[PDB]
Design a protein around this ligand. Structure first.
Ligand SMILES: [Mg+2]
Ligand SMILES: [Mg+2]
Ligand SMILES: [Mg+2]
Ligand SMILES: [Mg+2]
Ligand SMILES: [Mg+2]
Ligand SMILES: [Mg+2]
Ligand SMILES: [Mg+2]
Ligand SMILES: [Mg+2]
Ligand SMILES: [Mg+2]
Ligand SMILES: [Mg+2]
Ligand SMILES: [Mg+2]
Ligand SMILES: [Mg+2]
Ligand SMILES: [Mg+2]
Ligand SMILES: [Mg+2]
Ligand SMILES: [Mg+2]
Ligand SMILES: [Mg+2]
Ligand SMILES: [Zn+2]
Ligand SMILES: [Zn+2]
Ligand SMILES: [Zn+2]
Ligand SMILES: [Zn+2]
Lengths: 151, 129, 89, 196, 48, 61, 57, 229
RNA sequence: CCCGGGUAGUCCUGGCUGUAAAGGAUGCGGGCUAGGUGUCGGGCGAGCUUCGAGCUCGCCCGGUGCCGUAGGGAAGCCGUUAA
RNA sequence: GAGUGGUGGCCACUAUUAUUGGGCCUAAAGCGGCCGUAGCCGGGCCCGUAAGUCCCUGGCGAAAUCCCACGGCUCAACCGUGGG
C-alpha cells in the first residue's frame, strides 16, 4: 500500500520478458550514448531522458545492451553519465524532495494557520530522513552531511 | 509486506485443494520451493510441475491430484537432533507413520524418514499429510 | 533439598463411588477371598507397571532397549504368565 | 445434420436470452447484442438435445417425472407425458411429494426433468435429497448447481418450450424403437403449445 | 486482532517479559507472592 | 495464460506528412512527439493513447 | 472377500456413507458408470466419460 | 444370533414396504447392510434396519443417553414436554443417534429409539498409536475431530487395553460402535449432553473424510464395517 | 416539563485546557479462497449522434452499497470492503 | 478398615496464565488519530566464510537418590554385584 495514505493503487509499467534488443532497432551503443549525453547537456532529469528516448527515438529501455567496458552488468543512464562525468552529485529523488520542501516552507510563513498543508511538510521531511539514512549507509553521501531547513 | 514465500505457497495449495482446483500457480519462485515440490512429488502428493520464466523471480505451475489432507509451514524453524523426531511427529502428524516432515540438512532438503535413515538432524521447515 | 521418603506401592481409585467398578471389584474379592481392597489394588498396580514397560519399549530403539526388552520377556515368562514362545505384543 | 432446420429454431425464439448472465453459462453463450441482451448458441442446443434423447430412452417409461410451475410450460409437459408415457405434474408442486410417504400421491421417480431451476426450486430441492439424476433446461440467467445434464435454451417463451418438448419426445420415441424413422412422427408442433 | 506476538526465533526476552507482566492480573498469584493473607490473619497462619 | 504480464502499447513506424521522413514512435507518449528533421508534430499526448497526426506504415511487434 | 468403495469420477475421492452423491450410466454411450460427489455437483465441476470421451454436465 | 435370524424372518414376511429401498430389500435384491450406504438413498422405514441389522433390538445394544423435561408458558399454566436422547449400535461397525419428543416418557423413548435407527452410519477402525502397532481394529485408525454447538472433540489412538479415556457419554457412544481404547481432548461446555453426544458422533463420522493409500490399510489394519474374521 | 422576558456563552483576533456513545463499539502491512447486481473516477473497444467536455452497451484498475456459496460463530450474524 | 474423620498449605482440577495452547463487534478487553527512535520480523540469483545449526570423537558434571535383571535376609520393604 501507499506509505502514509494506505491506498492500493496498481498502475505501472508492464515490461515484457526479453533479453536481446529487437530486430527493428537500428541504433548502436555509441549512438545511444551520444544521444544521452546531448539530452543531459540540454538540462533534463534522468527519468525524463528515458521518456524522451522511448517516445521520440523509438528506443525501449537502454537496459538491453551489455556494458562494453564491464561485461558483468547491463547499461543504465546513470552509468552512462558517470562514464562522462555528468552524473548528479546528490541522488535525484532526494534533491526533488528537498526542493519541494523548500518551496512549501516559504508558503507557510505567510499562512501560519494552514495546518493541513503543514502535515504534508512533516511527511515530506520524514521521507527525506529515510532517504538520507539509506544513502549514508551505502556511502553515497558524506557521513557529516546533514539536512537543515534553516540552510 | 511479503515476509515468507514458502508459507504462502503451502497455504495457497491447501486453500486450493479444498475447493477442487486442478492446478495452481506459485508466484514468487525460489530454489527452496523447488526442493519442497520435488520432495512432495516423490511421495505422490502432487503431479508434475514446471518452471515459467518472466523477467521477475519466475513462477511455478503445479498440478493437483486431490491427495492432500493438510500442508503447512513450520515457524520458527526449530533445530532437531537425529534421535528426536518422534515428539515432533506427535505434535504435527495424526499417526505413527502418517505423512512427512520436511527437513533442511547440510546434505540437502529431504523428508524426515530419509534423514533418520542417514542418522542426521537439521531444521524443520514444513509438514504435509 | 529433601532426603528420600519411602512411597506406597499401590494406587487408589480416582473416584471412590463408581457403580460399575464397585461391582467388578466385589466380584473379584468374593471369588479370590482377599482381605481388603488395598491388597487387590496392589496386584492391579503390578499389572499396570508391566504394561507401562511394554508401551515404552515398543517406541524405542538402540542398544539398551533390546537388553531391557529381552529382560522383560524373560522375567514375565519366568513367573509363568506367558508361554515360552511369546513376543512383546 | 440437425434435428430441425435452424430457421425453425430462430423462428421459435430458442436463441433469445435475457439481460443477465452467469459465469458458468458462458460455455453456451454465442455473443451479446448492442442492447445488452445475450444470445445462446443453437448448435450446442441441438447436440445436447440428441444426447438427452439418447439418455432418457434407457429408463423405464413410467419412472420419468417432468414438472413445470410456469404457465407457458404446463401444456407442453402434459402433452409430453401423454406421448411418452411419463408422469407429468403441471402447476404447484406439493411439498413432500417425494419425501413424505404419508402423502396420498407419494411417488419416487428415477430421473426428473426441470423446466426452470429458478421457478421449480422446491422440486429440485426434494430431488437432491433422494439422489437421482437431474436434467434441466437452463437459460443465460440460471446456475448449473446440482444439474447433471444441461440443455441450453430459452425456457420462458411459449413456442420455444413447445418446440423443445416436441423434439425431445420424438427423439425418445425414435431411440427406444417405437417409430422406425424420424419422419413417422405425425403429430403437429402446434398441439404442444398453449393457445391464446 | 492479528496473530499472537512475538513469534520470532530470537524474541525470547520480550515473550518472557510479556508473560511476567500479565501474570500479575491473576489474583491467586498476587496474594501468594505479596503474602497478603499473612498480613491480616488474626490466627497468624496457624490451623488452630 | 496471463501469468506473464504483456503490455497493451505498441511501437509504430510512421511517415511525416511535411518532411516525408520515417520514424518509430511510442503509442502512449507522455510528451509531444515531433519529427526529427522538420520539427512538425507527430503525436499529441492525452490521458491514455496518443493522437496520431502522421501516416501509419506498420505496427511493430 | 471385502467390498469396494465407490470413487468420484471428477475428483477421485471416496463417497461418504450419507452424502448427496449420484451415479448414472454415461449419457452418450451408456457403457460406463459416472459417479459425482456432493461437492462436485454443488460447484458444477465437469466430468468426462472414460470410454467415449464425451464430457460435461 | 439365532434369535435375531428368526426375528428378522418374522419381520420380513408381515412387512409391507412403502418406499423404493424398502421394495428392494423386500424382494431380496439387497441382502447386506453395507449395500445401502454411499449411493444417496433416503432411509425412511425403520424395518430396513430391523431386517438387515436385527441385533440393534437387543437390550444391550441400546442406550438412553439422557432425559429432560422442558416447559412452555401459557395463560393457563405450564405445558410440559419430554426430550429423550438415545443411541443404538451393533458393537461392530455401525452406530446411530436420535432424539424424540413426547407428552409422556414412554412415547418419547419409543420415538427416540426409532429415529436413532434412521440416522445410522458406518465407520472405520484400526490401530494407529505410536506405542501399540498391532493391526487390530480396537481403536480409531488416526486422530479425528468433531464439533457441535460450543463443544469441540478430538479423538486420539490408544494402546490396547488402555480403556476409554473420555466422559461417560463418549464412553457409551464409542462402546456401541465397537471401540475399546482411545485418548481424547475437549473444549467448550461438555455439561450440555446433546452437543457432547453430537460432537462425538460427528468425530466418528469424519473417519471417512481422511484420504488414505493402499499401504496405510495394511499398515494400520483399517476395517470398514464388520470385522469379518 | 408549557408561556412571556433575560446574564454568561454562542461570532472575530492571540494563548491555555486535551476531554465525548471521539462508535464501523471491529489496530496496521502481505498472500490466498464461487458467483450476482447498483453507483463514483480513469483508461480501452463497439454502436449512435442535434457533432456537445453528448448518449447507450461491454471489459480492466481503484473507491463506495446490497443479496449470497464454502468456511466461521453462543447466536444475532460476518462472508474478496471477512468476524 | 487397625484405622477412619475435622482444620490450614502446595500441585492437579484449569486451555481461570495459554511456547506446545486462550481471548478483545454485541459478554472483561484495540490507545481519539497519525509520524517516528531502539527492539523484533524482513523479496529473487551467483561466489566466499564457517559464528549459529547438524554428525563423529577426547576430558568433565562425587556418593546417596531414580529404572531394569540377577543374587542375600522366609518373600517383601531393605541391602549387594552389573547395565542405564
Ligand atoms: Mg537446606
Ligand atoms: Mg391468553
Ligand atoms: Mg454450528
Ligand atoms: Mg462521530
Ligand atoms: Mg469495489
Ligand atoms: Mg451475506
Ligand atoms: Mg477450582
Ligand atoms: Mg477464557
Ligand atoms: Mg481506536
Ligand atoms: Mg475505543
Ligand atoms: Mg530472503
Ligand atoms: Mg559452528
Ligand atoms: Mg551420582
Ligand atoms: Mg532367601
Ligand atoms: Mg528378591
Ligand atoms: Mg544399594
Ligand atoms: Zn518531418
Ligand atoms: Zn468429486
Ligand atoms: Zn461414454
Ligand atoms: Zn493396537
Amino acid at each position: 500500500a501507499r506509505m502514509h495514505a494506505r491506498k492500493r493503487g496498481k498502475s505501472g509499467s508492464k515490461r515484457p520478458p526479453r533479453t536481446a534488443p529487437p530486430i527493428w532497432l537500428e541504433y548502436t551503443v555509441e549512438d545511444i550514448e551520444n544521444l544521452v549525453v546531448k539530452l543531459r547537456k540540454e538540462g533534463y532529469s534522468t527519468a525524463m531522458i528515458g521518456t524522451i528516448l522511448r517516445d521520440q527515438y523509438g528506443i525501449p529501455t537502454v537496459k538491453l545492451f551489455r556494458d562494453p567496458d564491464n561485461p558483468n552488468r547491463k547499461l543504465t543512464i546513470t552509468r552512462i553519465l558517470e562514464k562522462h562525468g555528468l552524473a548528479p552529485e546528490i541522488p535525484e529523488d532526494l534533491m526533488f524532495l528537498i526542493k519541494r520542501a523548500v518551496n512549501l516552507r516559504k508558503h507557510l510563513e505567510q499562512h501560519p494557520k494552514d495546518l493541513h498543508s503543514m502535515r504534508g511538510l512533516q511527511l515530506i521531511e520524514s521521507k527525506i530522513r529515510r532517504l538520507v539514512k539509506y544513502y549514508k549507509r551505502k556511502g553515497k553521501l558524506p557521513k557529516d552531511w546533514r539536512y537543515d531547513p534553516e540552510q | 509486506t511479503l515476509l515468507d514465500p514458502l508459507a504462502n505457497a503451502l497455504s495457497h495449495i491447501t486453500n486450493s485443494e479444498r475447493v477442487g482446483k486442478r492446478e495452481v500457480y506459485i508466484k514468487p519462485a525460489s530454489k527452496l520451493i523447488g526442493e519442497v515440490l520435488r520432495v512432495m512429488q516423490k511421495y505422490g502428493y502432487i503431479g508434475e510441475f514446471e518452471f515459467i520464466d518472466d523477467g521477475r523471480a519466475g513462477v511455478y505451475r503445479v498440478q493437483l491430484l486431490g491427495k492432500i489432507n493438510k500442508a503447512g509451514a513450520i515457524k520458527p524453524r526449530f533445530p532437531v537432533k537425529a534421535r528426536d523426531y518422534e515428539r515432533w511427529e506427535k505434535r504435527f502428524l495424526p499417526a505413527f507413520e502418517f505423512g512427512i516432515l520436511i527437513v533442511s540438512t547440510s546434505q540437502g532438503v529431504m523428508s524426515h524418514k530419509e534423514a533418520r535413515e542417514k542418522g542426521i538432524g537439521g531444521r524443520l521447515i514444513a509438514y504435509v499429510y | 533439598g529433601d532426603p528420600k521418603r519411602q512411597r506406597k506401592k499401590y494406587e487408589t481409585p480416582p473416584h471412590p463411588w463408581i457403580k460399575e467398578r464397585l461391582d467388578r471389584e466385589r466380584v473379584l474379592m468374593d471369588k479370590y477371598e482377599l482381605k481388603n481392597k488395598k491388597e487387590l489394588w496392589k496386584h492391579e498396580t503390578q499389572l499396570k507397571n508391566f504394561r507401562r514397560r511394554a508401551r515404552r519399549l515398543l517406541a524405542a530403539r538402540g542398544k539398551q532397549a533390546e537388553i531391557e526388552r529381552e529382560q522383560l520377556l524373560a522375567r514375565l515368562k519366568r513367573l509363568g504368565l506367558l508361554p515360552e514362545d511369546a513376543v512383546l505384543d | 445434420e440437425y434435428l430441425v432446420p435452424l430457421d425453425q429454431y430462430l423462428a421459435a425464439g430458442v436463441h433469445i436470452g435475457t439481460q443477465q448472465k452467469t459465469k458458468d453459462m458462458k460455455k453456451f453463450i454465442y455473443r451479446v447484442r448492442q442492447d445488452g441482451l445475450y444470445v445462446l448458441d443453437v448448435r450446442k442446443t441441438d447436440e445436447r438435445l440428441k444426447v438427452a434423447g439418447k439418455f432418457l430412452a434407457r429408463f423405464d417409461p413410467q419412472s420419468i417425472l417432468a414438472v413445470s410451475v410456469r404457465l407457458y410450460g404446463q401444456k407442453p409437459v402434459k402433452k409430453f407425458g401423454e406421448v411418452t408415457g411419463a408422469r407429468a405434474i403441471p402447476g404447484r408442486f406439493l411439498p413432500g411429494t417425494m419425501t413424505n410417504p404419508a402423502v396420498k400421491n407419494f411417488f419416487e421417480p428415477d430421473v426428473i426433468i426441470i423446466t426452470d431451476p429458478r421457478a421449480d426450486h422446491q422440486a429440485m430441492k426434494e430431488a437432491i435429497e433422494i439422489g437421482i439424476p437431474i436434467v434441466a433446461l437452463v437459460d443465460t440467467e440460471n446456475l448449473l448447481s446440482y444439474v447433471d445434464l444441461a440443455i441450453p435454451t430459452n425456457n420462458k417463451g411459449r413456442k420455444a418450450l413447445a418446440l423443445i418438448y416436441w423434439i425431445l419426445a420424438r427423439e425418445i420415441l425414435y431411440n427406444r424403437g417405437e417409430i422406425s424413422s424420424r419422419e413417422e412422427f405425425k403429430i403437429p408442433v402446434e398441439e404442444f403449445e398453449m393457445k391464446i | 486482532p492479528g496473530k499472537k506476538a512475538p513469534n520470532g526465533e530470537f524474541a525470547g526476552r520480550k515473550l518472557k517479559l510479556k508473560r511476567k507482566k500479565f501474570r500479575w492480573s491473576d489474583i491467586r498469584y498476587k496474594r501468594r507472592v505479596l503474602r497478603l493473607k499473612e498480613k491480616s490473619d488474626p490466627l497468624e497462619g496457624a490451623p488452630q | 495464460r496471463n501469468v506473464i504480464p504483456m503490455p497493451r502499447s505498441r511501437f509504430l513506424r510512421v511517415k511525416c506528412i511535411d518532411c516525408g521522413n520515417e520514424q518509430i514512435v511510442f503509442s502512449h507518449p507522455a510528451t509531444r512527439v515531433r519529427c526529427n528533421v522538420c520539427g512538425a508534430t507527430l503525436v499529441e499526448p492525452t490521458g491514455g493513447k496518443g493522437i496520431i497526426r502522421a501516416k501509419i506504415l506498420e505496427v511493430l511487434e | 472377500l471385502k467390498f469396494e468403495i465407490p470413487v468420484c469420477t471428477s475428483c477421485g475421492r471416496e463417497i461418504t456413507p450419507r452424502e448427496h452423491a449420484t451415479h448414472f450410466v454415461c449419457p452418450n454411450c451408456g457403457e460406463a458408470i459416472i459417479w459425482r460427489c456432493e461437492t462436485c455437483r454443488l460447484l458444477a465441476k465437469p466430468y468426462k466419460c472414460p470410454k467415449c470421451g464425451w464430457e460435461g454436465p | 444370533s439365532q434369535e435375531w435370524k428368526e426375528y428378522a424372518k418374522r419381520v420380513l414376511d408381515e412387512w409391507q414396504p412403502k418406499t423404493k429401498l424398502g421394495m428392494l430389500v423386500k424382494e431380496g435384491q439387497i441382502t447386506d447392510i453395507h449395500e445401502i450406504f454411499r449411493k444417496g438413498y433416503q432411509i425412511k422405514e425403520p424395518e430396513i434396519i430391523d431386517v438387515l441389522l436385527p441385533e440393534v433390538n437387543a437390550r444391550e445394544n441400546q442406550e438412553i443417553l439422557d432425559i429432560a423435561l422442558t416447559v412452555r408458558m401459557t395463560d393457563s399454566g405450564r405445558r410440559v414436554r419430554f426430550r429423550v436422547l438415545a443411541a443404538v449400535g451393533n458393537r461392530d461397525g455401525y452406530v446411530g443417534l436420535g432424539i424424540g419428543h413426547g407428552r409422556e416418557v414412554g412415547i418419547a423413548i419409543r420415538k427416540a429409539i426409532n429415529y436413532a435407527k434412521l440416522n445410522i452410519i458406518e465407520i472405520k477402525r484400526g490401530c494407529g498409536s505410536w506405542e501399540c502397532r498391532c493391526r487390530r481394529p480396537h481403536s480409531v485408525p488416526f486422530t479425528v475431530e468433531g464439533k457441535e454447538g460450543s463443544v469441540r472433540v478430538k479423538l486420539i489412538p490408544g494402546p490396547r487395553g488402555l480403556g476409554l479415556v473420555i466422559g461417560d457419554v463418549g464412553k457409551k457412544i464409542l462402546r456401541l460402535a465397537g471401540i475399546q481404547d482411545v485418548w481424547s481432548q475437549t473444549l467448550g461446555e461438555t455439561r450440555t449432553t446433546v452437543n457432547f453426544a453430537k460432537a462425538v458422533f460427528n468425530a466418528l463420522y469424519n473417519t471417512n473424510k481422511v484420504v488414505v493409500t493402499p499401504e496405510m490399510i495394511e499398515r494400520y489394519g483399517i476395517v470398514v464395517g464388520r470385522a469379518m474374521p
